[PDB]
Symmetry: D2
């Protein structure tokens, strides 16, 4: 699993469950080509987005639908979404975890990368 | 000053100076129109982007050029940029500080909103 | 002002007002001696804790009463407090801002240090 | 596993490996009784600190030796350590993950709690 997304909720101290996540790869045209999508599991994790062969070097965008998450909880959110844009695999394929920690008016994101 | 952007460096424990920031506003046709730009000062702050009259209700995008900041320090960071997208002034005029705290493989962002 | 503490609320997108803050300095016998205390203002900031002359080299502890802040809003938060312990002025006098960004089940803290 | 600690490195975008972690429970005397300790694994995780029977309600302190971690990497750190103090199990036993995301001049901590 070369790409995993994990979303956490800092208000409830829990995984952020059922969060929609969309992944895009920048076309050599310079626009965002759809790549994969899913919703986070009960553990806040979204696995199985891509494969080793498909996840080539490039610029990728992960869009996390934070606004829908907070609205479903009845909590006013600040952001329209949380976007993470990064270059992948430029020094060889790696296993990427993109983690996001959500609050209504703030979010954090980190990359945890491991070499298999 | 209804919109201020502040950028901090979590590696050196300092303001992030000379960071380029571009602001866009979503037009009626759903395209992003250039709204304002600038660079952070010695305090990490960017003031004077807009005025009370100009900063109407809308969806705004703040794009912080974090990659150039790290590259100038010799570092190849994870993110291409840090983008913050939000609806502004939906309940009347507010003053917004958009803060970002930067590390090579992570960033946090928060909004501090006050009622004038 | 060589030591300032700033506290922000990530749920409401606002300063965290009226947060109690206690500062201690480690004595020669390794005990924590009370150094200064105060509460955050309407801006989330606590100024005037110490002076250039008093704020000598040492190990300092800043204890932020985050639990009382959340409890007053009806929330039972995860943390009992947020503590920040650091060596100060080891390379000469500096001005320190200790910032904390609060959510019920998470907090972040950073230092912004400038040379007077 | 009722209590797990996970430590991540925001500078390298990786788990924080071999970080020393010490856990204490507040005595009814009001001082910190040693409880468990360990070092983070290659995944940045520390498992097996306690058991369901032993991890009773109480106030617990997790001390993460961040200073030694940064020193071993040759990077100047701000904090003497990162402490997380929390009340556990007051609404019944839960599975707690205490996560910490480390930078040299900043850290974050969150609790991810799941009900089995
Ligand atoms: C529950 O398990 C995990 C928790 C966490 C976090 O708490 C976290 C903390 C932050 O400050 C920021 C963030 F984006 C995530 C990160 C990972 N991870 O990355 O592998 C986990 O497996
Ligand atoms: C230097 O003083 C400030 C510090 C800070 C932070 O520590 C901070 C923490 C985070 O997790 C994320 C972030 F984007 C900023 C925020 C503001 N602010 O918003 O006005 C400050 O004035």
């Amino acid at each position: 699993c070369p790409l995993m997304v994990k979303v956490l909720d800092a208000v409830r101290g829990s995984p952020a469950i059922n969060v929609a996540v969309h992944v895009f790869r920048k076309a050599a045209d310079d626009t965002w080509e759809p790549f994969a999508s899913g919703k986070t599991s009960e553990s806040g994790e979204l696995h199985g987005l891509t494969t080793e062969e498909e996840f080539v070097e490039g610029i990728y965008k992960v869009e996390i639908d934070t606004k829908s998450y907070w609205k479903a909880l009845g909590i006013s959110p600040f952001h329209e979404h949380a976007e993470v844009v990064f270059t992948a695999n430029d020094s060889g394929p790696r296993r990427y975890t993109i983690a996001a920690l959500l609050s209504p008016y703030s979010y954090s994101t980190t990359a945890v990368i491991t070499n298999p």
